[PDB]
Design a protein around this nucleic acid. Structure first.
Lengths: 154, 121, 142, 51, 124
RNA sequence: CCCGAAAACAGGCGGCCACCGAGGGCCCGGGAAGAAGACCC
RNA sequence: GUGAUCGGGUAGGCGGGCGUGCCGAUGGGGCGGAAGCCGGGCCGUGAGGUCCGGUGGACCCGUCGGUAUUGCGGAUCCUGCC
RNA sequence: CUAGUACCGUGAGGGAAAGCUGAAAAGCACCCCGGGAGGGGGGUGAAAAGAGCCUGAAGCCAGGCGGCGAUAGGAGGGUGCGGCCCGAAAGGGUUGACCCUCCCCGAAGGAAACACGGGCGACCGUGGAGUACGAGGGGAGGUGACCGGGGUUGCACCGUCCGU
C-alpha cells in the first residue's frame, strides 16, 4: 500500500473483510453522502444494479438532508429526488476495486455485503471568478474521499 | 507469624485450595467475609474453608480456629489476600472464605481434606 | 369512574368540585348536562355568550378562539378554564373527563351522585336560566 | 522597529474599522501596536537605570 | 469522634456545593473547553445582582473545617515523594505518600519496597 | 351553497387478506387534468 | 475571650494570595520514557494544583531571594483557518 | 528561505508570504484491479515518521455507539425527585456499600382521640400534656455488593442573553 490515509472503521478483520478507497475525487460530497446512505447495508451486486439504474435515469435517489428548490418524483416515498451520474460512476469503480481485492484474498464474491460506506471532504482547490464593480470572488472545487468495506457472510 | 496461625503449610495445599474456591465460584455457594463465614460454621452450612496469612491485625481472624476446631472441617492457609480477592472475583482483598456445595471440585475437596487431615495427624 | 347528574345544579360550583376531582386522579362522567342552571339575567347571559361566539382571529379563522355552542361543550369548557391547560398535568386531567347530553343506554340502570355544595336549593332568587336555553339561542343542536 | 510602513485610513462609513492600512494589495494594517507587524506599545529601552 | 463528625460535615458540604463557572459557559466552545470561574462585573448582569433562578458565586462560607481542610478521604494528609530520602521523614499514622508522576519504574521499585517495610501507606 | 375524519371520544357500514400474500407503486399507450408531485381513462 | 450594638455594594481607597517567562543559590527527576495534547479521579470558597490511563519521543519541576514585551470575550480591533 | 525579491503604480514612490522525515534513504522489490492519478496486498525501519513528511489542538465535516425523538411554548439555565447508558485505574468499600429494623440523650418548637363545662355559632378554656414527636449526637445488631461520580432525558416549580 502507501500509508497516506487511514479509515474510520474500527475492528477490521483481514480474514473476512476487504477494503477499497477513492481519494481526491472531483464530485460533490453532498450527493456522495446521499447515495451512500442508500447503497450501504446491501449486497455488492444489488448495489451495482442500483447504480446502473441511476446512471440510466430509471431510478431516482431520495434527497433527505440537501433539498433546496428540489422537485418531487413518480410513485411512493418521493419527496425530493435526484439522479447523480458522476458520483455513481465513481462509486462503481470503487466497488469493482473491492470485489477484486476480496477475490485475490480468497473470499467468495456472491456472498459479500457492504458494511461500511463513508464519504469525507478533501482539500479545496482555489480559483476566482470576476464580478461587477471591481471585485473577484471565490470559484472553488470541493473534492471528496470515499472508503468502502465489504464482508463475506456465513 | 501471628497468633491465629498454628502450623506451616506447603504450597500445593493452599494453591489447590485457591483453585478449588475458583472452580466453585463456577457454580456453587461461596460466602466471602468473616461475618458470613462464622455464621456459616455456626449454622453448620460450612463444609470447606480458607484463611489468609497477612490478615493484619488478627483480632478478626484470631478467633476463627476456635470455631473450626469444634466444627472439624478443612481450613486451608493461603498466604496472599489479592489472590483470594481474584479467586472470589472481587477487587477487594479477602481474609476468609467459606465454600459450600462444591460442584466441579468435589474431587479436590476430598483430596485436600485428605492432605490436611494427614497434616492434622 | 364516578357518574354525576347535572340536574338542579350550579355550573361553576359543579365545575370547581369536578376539576379538583380530576386533578386528584379520578375519572368523571357528567350526564344530563342540558339541565344545569346559570344564575343571572337572560339578556346579560346571552350577550356574554354571543360576544364570545363572535370572537375570532382576523387574519385566519382556522386559528381562533373556538368557543362553543353546545351544552356539553359549554360545561366541558368551564371545567377546562378551571385547570392548568398549558401543562401536561392539566391535559391529562382534562382527558379524564366525559360529558353527555341525556343519559346514554351505556350508563342507564346505574346509581348517580349529586354534589351537595352545588344545588338550586341554596338560592333565594327566582332568576335563573338553563344551559339548553343558552344553546338554543346560540344555534346549537341539543 | 514597527515604524517603517506608510499607511492610509479608511474613514467612517465603510463597514470597516478606522485602522491604518497600506495602499497596495493585500492592504494589511500597519504601524499600530495592536497590529501584526507593528510597533510594540511599551518596549524595553537602553535609557533605563539598573545600577 | 470529632474528626469523623467534621468529615461528615465536609462530605455534605462538598456534595451540595455547586460547580462555580462563568456566566454563559454552555454557549461558546471557548468556555466549554476551559471551564473556570471569573467574577461578573457588568452593570446589568444578573449573576452579579444575585437573583432567583441564576447560578451562584463563591464565598468564604463554603469552606471546610480547619481540622480536616486538605485531608484525603482516607483521613490522611498527603506528601509528594520523589525519592527514598523524602520517603523517610514521614509519620505513618497521620501522613501518607503520593509518588510523583515523573518518577521512573526503576526507582518506583525501591520506593515501594522501602515503604511497605517502614509501614507507610501509598495511594498510587 | 363552499371546505371538511388530525374532529385526541383522532368516526360508522359492507367486503377482502393476516394472526406464501389482499392490495399498491414503477413501467407502456394517451388527456377531458397539470409549474414538480398529484388526477382521469 | 468578646461581638443584640460584625457579615449587601457602583465610582474609589486598603489587605492577602493563584498563575506566566529569565537570572543568583539550594534540593531533586528523566529513553525502565521529559515537555506538550486528549479523556477522567481527588484536594481546593476560588484563582488553580496534583495523580491514573492513553499519545508522544528529550528535556523539566520544587523552596529562598531578584527581575519582567507578566494573565483577554469585546476596541464597526489585527492575522490565519473554517 | 533563489528579499528590498515577486507583485502594484505613467511616475515620484509602495511592498509580501514562506523554517524542522529519519541514526542511516535503508526514499517502498514483487503481485492483483484500474485509461490513468491511484487503490489493495506484501516488504524496510526501534517507530510510517511515506516527502501532500517532528508534535499534530480547536472551530468544521462524515460514520459508528449511547440517550431523546412527528398533540407541541420559551434567552436554551437553576433547585429537587426519577428512567435508560458507561463505570479498569487514580475515590470509598468484604477488617464489610446501599437499604432495614431496636434502644438512649434530645435544642428551638410541639399534637390528637377522649372526659368535664362556656358561647346563637365558627370555636374556645381545664385535664390529657410539655406527653407522642422533634435537627442532630452515640451505641447494638441482621443483609450481603454496590455507592459516590459522569452522559442524556421525563415531571413539578423558578427564570425576558452578554458588554456599554
Amino acid at each position: 500500500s502507501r500509508g497516506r490515509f487511514s479509515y474510520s472503521f474500527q475492528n477490521f478483520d483481514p480474514e473476512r473483510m476487504a477494503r477499497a478507497s477513492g481519494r481526491d475525487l472531483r464530485i460533490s460530497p453532498k450527493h456522495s453522502v446521499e447515495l451512500l446512505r442508500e447503497i450501504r447495508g446491501m449486497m455488492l451486486n444489488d448495489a451495482l444494479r442500483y447504480l446502473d439504474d441511476v446512471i440510466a435515469k430509471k431510478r431516482p435517489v431520495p434527497m433527505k438532508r440537501f433539498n433546496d428548490s428540489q422537485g418531487h418524483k413518480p410513485g411512493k416515498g418521493f419527496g425530493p429526488g435526484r439522479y447523480p451520474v458522476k458520483v455513481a460512476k465513481a462509486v462503481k469503480k470503487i466497488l469493482l476495486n473491492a470485489k477484486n481485492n476480496a477475490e485475490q484474498k480468497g473470499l467468495d464474491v456472491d456472498r459479500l455485503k457492504i458494511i461500511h460506506a463513508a464519504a469525507h471532504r478533501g482539500p479545496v482547490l482555489r480559483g476566482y471568478i470576476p464580478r461587477a464593480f471591481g471585485r473577484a470572488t471565490p470559484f472553488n472545487e470541493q473534492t471528496t474521499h470515499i472508503e468502502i468495506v465489504v464482508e463475506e457472510i456465513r | 507469624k501471628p497468633s491465629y496461625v498454628k502450623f506451616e503449610v506447603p504450597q500445593e495445599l493452599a494453591e489447590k485450595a485457591l483453585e478449588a474456591v475458583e472452580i466453585a465460584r463456577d457454580t456453587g455457594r461461596i460466602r466471602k467475609g468473616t461475618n458470613e463465614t462464622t455464621k456459616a460454621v455456626e449454622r453448620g452450612q460450612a463444609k470447606l474453608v480458607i484463611i489468609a496469612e497477612d490478615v493484619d491485625p488478627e483480632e478478626i481472624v484470631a478467633h476463627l480456629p476456635p470455631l473450626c476446631e469444634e466444627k472439624e472441617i478443612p481450613y486451608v492457609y493461603v498466604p496472599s489476600k489479592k489472590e483470594l480477592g481474584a479467586a472470589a472475583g472481587l477487587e477487594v482483598p479477602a481474609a476468609s472464605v467459606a465454600i459450600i456445595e462444591p460442584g466441579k471440585a468435589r474431587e479436590l475437596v476430598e483430596d485436600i481434606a485428605m492432605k490436611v487431615k494427614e497434616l492434622m495427624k | 369512574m364516578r357518574i354525576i347528574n347535572a340536574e338542579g345544579l350550579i355550573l361553576g360550583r359543579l365545575a370547581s368540585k369536578v376539576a379538583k376531582m380530576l386533578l386528584e386522579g379520578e375519572e368523571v362522567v357528567i350526564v344530563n348536562a342540558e339541565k344545569a342552571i346559570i344564575t343571572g339575567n337572560r339578556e346579560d347571559i346571552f350577550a356574554k355568550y354571543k360576544q364570545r361566539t363572535e370572537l375570532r382571529t382576523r387574519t385566519n379563522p382556522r386559528r381562533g378562539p373556538f368557543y362553543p355552542k353546545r351544552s356539553d361543550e359549554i360545561v366541558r369548557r368551564t371545567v377546562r378554564g378551571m385547570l392548568p391547560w398549558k401543562t401536561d398535568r392539566g391535559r391529562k386531567a382534562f382527558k379524564r373527563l366525559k360529558v353527555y347530553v341525556g343519559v346514554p343506554k351505556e350508563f342507564e340502570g346505574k346509581e348517580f351522585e349529586t354534589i351537595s355544595e352545588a344545588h338550586m336549593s341554596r338560592l333565594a332568587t327566582p332568576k335563573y336560566v338553563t344551559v339548553g336555553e343558552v344553546a338554543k339561542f346560540l344555534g346549537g343542536k341539543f | 522597529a514597527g515604524k517603517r510602513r506608510v499607511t492610509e485610513n479608511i474613514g467612517k462609513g465603510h463597514g470597516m474599522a478606522r485602522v491604518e492600512r497600506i495602499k497596495t494589495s493585500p492592504r494589511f494594517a500597519a504601524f499600530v501596536p495592536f497590529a501584526v507587524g507593528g510597533r510594540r506599545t511599551h518596549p524595553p529601552k537602553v535609557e533605563k537605570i539598573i545600577w | 469522634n470529632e474528626k469523623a463528625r467534621l468529615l461528615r460535615i465536609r462530605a455534605k458540604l462538598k456534595r451540595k456545593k455547586p460547580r462555580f463557572l462563568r456566566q454563559e459557559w454552555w454557549r461558546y466552545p471557548k468556555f466549554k473547553n476551559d471551564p473556570k470561574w471569573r467574577r461578573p462585573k457588568g452593570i446589568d448582569s444578573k449573576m452579579r445582582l444575585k437573583k432567583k433562578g441564576k447560578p451562584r458565586s463563591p464565598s468564604i462560607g463554603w469552606s471546610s473545617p480547619k481540622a480536616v481542610r486538605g485531608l484525603h478521604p482516607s483521613g490522611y494528609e498527603e506528601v509528594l515523594v520523589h525519592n527514598v530520602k523524602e520517603l523517610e521523614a514521614i509519620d505513618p499514622t497521620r501522613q501518607a505518600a503520593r509518588i510523583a508522576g515523573t518518577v521512573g519504574a526503576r526507582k518506583r521499585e525501591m520506593i515501594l519496597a522501602r515503604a511497605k517495610e517502614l509501614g507507610v501507606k501509598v495511594l498510587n
